[PDB]
């Protein structure tokens, strides 16, 4: 058995979940030296078709490096681990778990942002909307949707109000159910 | 004859059939306005106990004053009172909840009735044998055909009693799904033991044919619902010119999917749903906006009036359709459906919570088990049982009637304070926003990427394949109302914009 | 038995009654979209000849392939196919046209059918006597009961064939009024001669009782229509809370005025109108704006589908309900209803034009006389005549059928080019304005002053008394939706503002 | 027989219509000397209840005089005489008839106007609307209706466009049927 307990504490998975994820890791490595880079992710058949493919591929990575090791795939993936009520209310000392609802929204705001400057902006919303929506739809119509969202969301007055009210408009959206994944053993 | 007024003569023999029906519908409407107008009554009573009370009150006035109360029949029900309620439920369907909560809704129904049915069958067999002369002689199959008719929660009563409480959308969709998908395994445990009653020796191959029968009754039911859904979508493509026939292609194309699938003896209750979820995407798009506010605001009236009528009818058919009281059997079926329901729920939630994301908090389990109401599909199915094949239906009706009354009154007037005492989450999602919608689709695409990165093929990946499929091959050969390519962002923006503009213009001062 | 698939079995004995009906309604819908889609057909044919052609085509396919075509019955008609069409006509009623053109509409109906009925009676009596053995032996009363069933223009066919031509609003309201008010003197010349058939010696007092019968059948019919109109207005007062039962208080309160007035053997066709003109002022006000766009856009669909169905049914009941051809009688009834209609029209317009404001230009007279179509109330009334009391109904049906076909085809495919050739004014009033409305009410008040200055008590003075009455004593005890005092100026402004705002918001780009 | 033929030509009535109108004239005179004044009209039971009562009473009169003679009641009343097609298309020489459609609208514009200056104005529309409508309804709401009508009607640009387009928006309204009265013999 390899070293997996420290990952099990840092992430919060069980043991078989980590084993299965490492199995997929070995399958998708296509070479030990290139454990995970941008090229390895881009050639996955379906996510590239997904509009948010490049954002996700550039979203796992901590910094400008183009390597991902297995432990990191686990650090960046745990953010989806389903929140467990008893095991989160058992001991309340600090926000150790990487799947706390705060982090499940910080992940979204980090996907929106161009760089990690905590700045959602009309440029950012317009870019992501033109990603999700096709290219045929009217551009200043996209601007209308984006600026309507900006106006209704921003209580900061700078049109940004990047995170604090981001949570406030998302609280009506149950993210515990929405953005979490059960990784089969 | 008729010296005075030669023409004027009473012809109550051709109008009586529609005039009595119009009077009954008027009684439904007047009671519905009545117990909304009277203050504070909506809290104490579940507004659906009073419908049964009025039903039996007018059944005790119609009777006792020399007129047999009309026993809500069985097939003026499967065809005329149920399809509106089922189409309402399956049209305004919160589809995202099914798509995420599909495992539980398809396992609290397929193997959550196929269990209670057999649980009641077994234990009521036991009580019948050791009961006494009158209860005895029912025999197993005449008890399995009671378990399968009493343990079929009503897609009517559950919704009509859970509309007012506004339970958490997850719990509400769980009772939705239980009831809507229940009939797929009630109409294969009611037409199967009837043919397993007179079929002298059962064998074991016939049970395998029973399983294949269930697969057919479910899958073919949904498939017929789809086939008259890709035709009420393909026919509302061509109706740009003919604007006054829009509110009809949704009805005679589902109420002809509910009759071409109750014909074959498939499950109509679920084929109607499957034809109410393949039409809305492609009939909300290419018809106009006033025809749609007609379809929606008419289906709501249909279902409200139909639920009121069939509760008044369980009321008026318990004064002339309940008799032959047998204490041991009645008390046994009460205890052995309640204890059956709660035990099945506890077991299956222990099973599920090893798989789902948001675990079923014991509040959820108790409001599921305690909130699974029995309704008119337990009465109108205990009334199709002929008195010649099964010589014990003097008693099945009174057991069914006491169970309907127990799960509509004491599980109806008490589910109201029960959620308050247990402090369950109550409808956080009252209103709607735009940022909600945009970020929701963002998170959906995020997970659709992540799950395929991992390899965990799940709900999001299938939603992805289905949505790409009916964004390439369908929605260009089925909508053709210039909306062949407009994503849900744009459509939702237009809907919200139209709504707020209408409200602003109404607020003239 | 049923070795394979134990449950799956064909149950076509309970669903057949609703399944055949659903198929017929689907055929109506598909044909309606079909001859709108196919180009240029709407010009050549009156879009209601093709409905009869398809009716008889599918009646010749149902027959000849071993199945008796369903003879559109009589009382699946008076009660189920007619009330939608009549309520549509009497709900969307251009009331100002009736209020000004009331003399002609009440004299082209009361003494414009009571004349054609007797004209056909007399002259077809004459032809029958001198006809031959087969035609002979009908006798006067068996011919008056043919005049009175053939000379009753259909509130269905006239509207269904004059919808497409868009005739001058005056001429269109004249045919509206003729047909809607005709039944008040068809159902007192059909239930009166039937009782004047077996009533051995007529006497003369019985005819006086006949006149009093007509006064009752008309006035009491309108009065019952009003009484269930001041109750569907008083019940939509209380429905602020219950928003999902609005589209129903308009139907079960008029379709229960059409059955509590067809019960007594009053005229339902006009009681339904009178209950469709006392509800709209007090049910357009206090219910919401989406329930109203439901009522309106559903009544339109009702009537469109019902007219299509009964034309398909006159089509499918002429392949199995027309027989016993007799040349002298058929040709005689054609000529002697056409010559009767035009002569009655010429006479009564000479009478009227000595009283009305805008004289009936001979274009008006010819499009009235030539455009009075016969429809299913001539067929479904020639089918209630039992073959035992009247032993000549083998022939009455074929005469009625040839007359229906003549006034629906040759007075249907030709009324289209006829108005073009005569160059009659065609629907100048397509659109609507605000200045129109304001100045119209100004002129109305001007005349209401002038007529009382002169002493000429007329239409405007009665409108004044009625409007002051239901602005003081009613509309404060009947609307109570905060709109107890808002004049029609304000309501019209809000309606137009809402409409233009909705259209602007729809035009996003 | 009194002198009635010149009235019959000037107005356009028949003879019995004039006789019946003179009968009503004698009934409502309440005194020979006061043939018709403002006081005589105001005490008619119903028109005073009508919002346009005072406008009509001041509308018959030619000028500031407060007498009306019978011949004038006929001149000012003929304006409602129904237009007769054959008798108007028989001879076309001049607009002699007092019930020609032009005069049937000039009567309206003369009812609107404060003084005979041919000037419909927001003051005039607001006054007449507050007459027809009750006093309870909102005042700047009446202004909204009035100015909406002004804007849609006025192609003159001065907000007035008093008569020429007045006819143009009324042509869609059949006034031949609308504003005419059959005076029973
Ligand atoms: C015969 C009637 C008593 C009936 C009973 C059960 C079913 C059924 O298969 N599924 C339901 N009801 N949900 C259909 C019918 S039917 C074809 O309408 O007459
Ligand atoms: C019996 C049926 C044949 C019938 C015939 C005539 C009438 C009538 O009085 N007026 C009409 N139809 N316009 C009513 C009916 S009924 C009471 O619906 O069965």
Residue numbers in the entry:
A (entry chain D), D (entry chain C): 11 to 195
B (entry chain B), C (entry chain A): 85 to 593
Structure paper excerpt:
Sodium/proton exchanger 1 (NHE1) is an electroneutral secondary active transporter present on the plasma membrane of most mammalian cells and plays critical roles in regulating intracellular pH and volume homeostasis. Calcineurin B-homologous protein 1 (CHP1) is an obligate binding partner that promotes NHE1 biosynthetic maturation, cell surface expression and pH-sensitivity. We find that NHE1 assembles as a symmetrical homodimer, with each subunit undergoing an elevator-like conformational change during cation exchange. Each monomer is made up of a dimerization domain (TMs 1−3 and 7−10) and a core domain (TMs 4−6 and 11−13).
